[PDB]
Design an enzyme around this catalytic site. Sequence first.
Site, PDB file in Angstrom:
ATOM      1  CG  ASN G   6      11.055  28.759 -10.404  1.00  0.00           C
ATOM      2  OD1 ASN G   6      11.326  27.636  -9.877  1.00  0.00           O
ATOM      3  ND2 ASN G   6      11.725  29.682 -10.555  1.00  0.00           N
ATOM      4  CD  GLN G   7      11.670  22.172  -9.790  1.00  0.00           C
ATOM      5  OE1 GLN G   7      12.560  21.063  -9.870  1.00  0.00           O
ATOM      6  NE2 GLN G   7      11.091  22.065  -8.749  1.00  0.00           N
ATOM      7  CD  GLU G   8      11.704  20.147 -17.013  1.00  0.00           C
ATOM      8  OE1 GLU G   8      11.033  20.382 -18.095  1.00  0.00           O
ATOM      9  OE2 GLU G   8      12.562  19.528 -17.185  1.00  0.00           O
ATOM     10  CG  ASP G   9      10.589  25.650 -20.271  1.00  0.00           C
ATOM     11  OD1 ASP G   9      11.559  26.125 -19.946  1.00  0.00           O
ATOM     12  OD2 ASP G   9      10.357  24.504 -21.001  1.00  0.00           O
ATOM     13  CB  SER G  10       6.750  26.360 -14.203  1.00  0.00           C
ATOM     14  OG  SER G  10       5.362  26.641 -13.481  1.00  0.00           O
TER      15      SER G  10
END
Lengths: 64, 193, 192, 48, 98, 44, 134, 48, 252, 48
Positions: G6-10
Amino acid sequence: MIIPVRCFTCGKIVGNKWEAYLGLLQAEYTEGDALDALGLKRYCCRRMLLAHVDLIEKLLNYAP
Amino acid sequence: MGVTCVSQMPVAEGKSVQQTVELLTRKLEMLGAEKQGTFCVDCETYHTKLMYVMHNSEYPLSCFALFENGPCLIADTNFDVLMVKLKGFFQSAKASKIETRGTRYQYCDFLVKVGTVTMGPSARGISVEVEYGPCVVASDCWSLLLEFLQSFLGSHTPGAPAVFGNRHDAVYGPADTMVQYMELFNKIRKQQQ
Amino acid sequence: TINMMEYLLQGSVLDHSLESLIHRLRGLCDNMEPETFLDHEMVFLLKGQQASPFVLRARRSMDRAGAPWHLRYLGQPEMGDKNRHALVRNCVDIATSENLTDFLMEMGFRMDHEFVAKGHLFRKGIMKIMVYKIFRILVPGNTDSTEALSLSYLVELSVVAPAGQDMVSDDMKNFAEQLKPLVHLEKIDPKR
Amino acid sequence: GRPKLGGLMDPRQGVIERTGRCQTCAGNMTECPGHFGHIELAKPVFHV
Amino acid sequence: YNGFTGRKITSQIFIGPTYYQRLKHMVDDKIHSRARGPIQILNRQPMEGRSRDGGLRFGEMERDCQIAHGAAQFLRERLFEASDPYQVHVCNLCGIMA
Amino acid sequence: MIYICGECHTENEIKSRDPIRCRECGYRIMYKKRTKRLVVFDAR
Amino acid sequence: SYTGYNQEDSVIMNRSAVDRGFFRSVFYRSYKEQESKKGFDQEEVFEKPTRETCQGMRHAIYDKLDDDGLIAPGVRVSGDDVIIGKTVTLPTKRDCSTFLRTSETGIVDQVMVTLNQEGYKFCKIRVRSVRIPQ
Amino acid sequence: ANMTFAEIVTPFNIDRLQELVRRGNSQYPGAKYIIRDNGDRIDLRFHP
Amino acid sequence: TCPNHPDAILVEDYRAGDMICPECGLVVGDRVIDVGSEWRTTMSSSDRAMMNAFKEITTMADRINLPRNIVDRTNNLFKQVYEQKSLKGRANDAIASACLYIACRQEGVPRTFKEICAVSRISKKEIGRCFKLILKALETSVDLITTGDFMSRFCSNLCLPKQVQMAATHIARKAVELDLVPGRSPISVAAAAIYMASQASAEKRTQKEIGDIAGVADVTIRQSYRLIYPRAPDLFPTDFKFDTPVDKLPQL
Amino acid sequence: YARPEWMIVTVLPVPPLSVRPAVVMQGSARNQDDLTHKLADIVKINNQ
Ligand SMILES: [Zn+2]
Ligand SMILES: [Zn+2]
Ligand SMILES: [Zn+2]
Ligand SMILES: [Zn+2]
Ligand SMILES: [Zn+2]
């Protein structure tokens, strides 16, 4: 459009409680009281009934 | 050319198609019979009248084309290549191909072959052929094939075939075995159920 | 199966010089006694919906007893490069049982023209040279009486190559060159 | 209805139809680079 | 609790109902590839045909990026070999081809 | 070739030559009936 | 921060919820095709062509179309599929049929035939494709 | 599967490339085209 | 043109835009097919006159709300006639009006010569003459008009119910079948049938009204109606709700 | 490489077909390029 069969989160059967929920609301139950009577304890399940919009009822007003 | 007989033996009871061959072949092995390789008989069909082309593995290079009651041509494998080249001109039919694949057992000058006419991908039935290479004469070598069959086949033993037909001193032919196979194949294709 | 292409060069010899050519071919070719074959060939054509009729050539050797009939299919000419100087056709050769005439007629193939060929066959490596005098056949069915189509004899150099690699035509051209003073073997188009 | 010599769609200048080859270099549409024509002007004309 | 191991997560997660929306942008409608595809009439260059195989534009910025990289062979491939390779016969005496 | 009228929902056979129009309704919007060919859905 | 996906707007989605219809959607795409008899002998007609009758056709199978050249509702359609079979008379008849998007793979939802403002016959075909979150 | 890389056939990779050709374009991983020394391109799906 | 395959049909491909031999797979042509197009997925005097005629045709068609398909058919007919040039002596306006009438007839929604004249500056006589000349020039023909052709338009313009329109159509068709109006114009027969149906139904329309919409004189309507009146019960549909009984229909 | 007299147009080059290829529209109606139309104009004027 129609009440989902299963709670999206935990999968509890929720598709057979819409008519009973509406009946309780007609019987003057508060929304929370009606959910408790139906037995939806987890807020994930309570969300299904609380946030559901029954568009199928209006969709049926159009002739086939 | 050695007198041969082919018959279909029903699996019976709840015995699976393969289960019955396994048992019948073990019964043949219990005759002192020794395996002498493998045999494949693959046949294709044409809706032209009706054409049949069959090729027993026992014959390494021949391809047999039989026209029902009409004559059988025993030809080289290049015959299949000619057939494919004509194919656009030729009729094709719809998945009527029929094959019987099974072990070959040799018992002192008698070769017995039991196989499952597997139609397409699904097996259904059973073909037994007993051939006698020493017996050039035919139609009266029936006593032999009958006694040997009653020995192992027992019930469902065939009461001859019509390929012998009219009593004659005519020698048995590879064409006659192919005609027996064609009648047997027409019966599996249509027995149904 | 791979397909078999037949490389063919065809030329004619007048009868008076036949003896010189026979002696010459014997010398260049492998040392085998001459075949002296005699054969009857009937061509069958299939008149189906497509305009082109399939042509299958059936050959019976009258001279050689107990030899099977041979059935062959000859494809359209594939000649392209001028350098090849050969005629290339697809060919399938299948030995057939005596009951060939009946099978073909029941199938629907129709007998068209029949000829009887008599002559000598000699071979060098893969190359086969056939020298024969075509004879017309008259009367609906028989080989007892024949008339000569021509005083001359056609000479055909044929190789049934596997179709792998090439330079098969080059070897043929070289051999044809030797017979060229005695007889001009060239690729003659079947058309006219 | 067929290519004509000396016309705008001169078959010499290149390939006309995809399943065709020009008469000059005997090359198909992809292989043939196209060949120039010329027009003789009865009067000299300025170049813009 | 960690789903893989069932062990309590040391930090207590902030979890609750929130209203989310599914945007019309699906990867299915955006995914597209081009590998030896159709080309146009005059330019002989890639153009999308019967699919989303129109290729990608190798712009001046990408050209400058590859120049800075120094990958001359890759740049030549991208602009010439991949786009519209072509060969011509030219006379040595006079530069104009024929 | 069966078409359902968009107004009165009447099925009517129509050929490739005759105009597309309800036989009795006169309504000019037609809907093709569902294909007889059966399509399988995985209940996923 | 569960697994770093879910990193970087995931976002990490519940596969079981998605299986239970979570954020599931329909994508309806409508294709309109009109047959125009404009030209001295250049007329367009809805019909299933033949590999020999027309001047040229394609390897794509035309068996889906009906006698009227229109694909019936409830038929699965994928890439390289003809939904509308049109033929334009050559000044034979060239194939003027229309195809779908190769990526698109849905079911013909609704096929309607009518006369447009110009009075020409035309058909609108709505294809339904189910988009499960992925 | 849509994108391809042209590998030159070598005795080192002859067997692997033959297996890829046998697999063909139908099932990934496979191959889409075979280019002979002549430079001609052969479509595997059209020719199985 | 596969080199190894004399007379081999090469299959077209959309993935690469090439034609490939199906039996060997050899790619004949690299990107030769142009899938983008193959797969659909100072004015001359003559041309200026044609453009003016097209503009006039569009004006006339919009005057009576004719569809663009009929307009296009009229344009094609005018192009053919104008290039044929057998009507070069006749006015382009008259040729255009006659072409519009022929286009309506061919499309199966015929308009009366009077209807076309109402929208065209050209007279009915000139329109008919140009129509005959155009038919001769084109060596074509137009199906004979029937009473049912004008029923929809006439009844709709009169604002009659669908049942009345059906009754009028049935009456006119049955009268033609019975030959009660021999030689009578189909428009006159249709007007008489519409008058009969209107007088038998609640929505009653005067002879002057029906004549105004249909382009037929009230006297002609009177003659046709008198011819069909004796057998009105026979002509009327069986399941018709007579607001005025057929016996009490106006006698004139 | 450049003579002043050559600046004056005496022979007008005609681009090959590949430069101005003919397009197909509305069936088989060959749509000649703008270059083809202009070349037709110069051809007509030159002949006149
Ligand atoms: Zn829940
Ligand atoms: Zn060229
Ligand atoms: Zn030079
Ligand atoms: Zn209706
Ligand atoms: Zn080929």
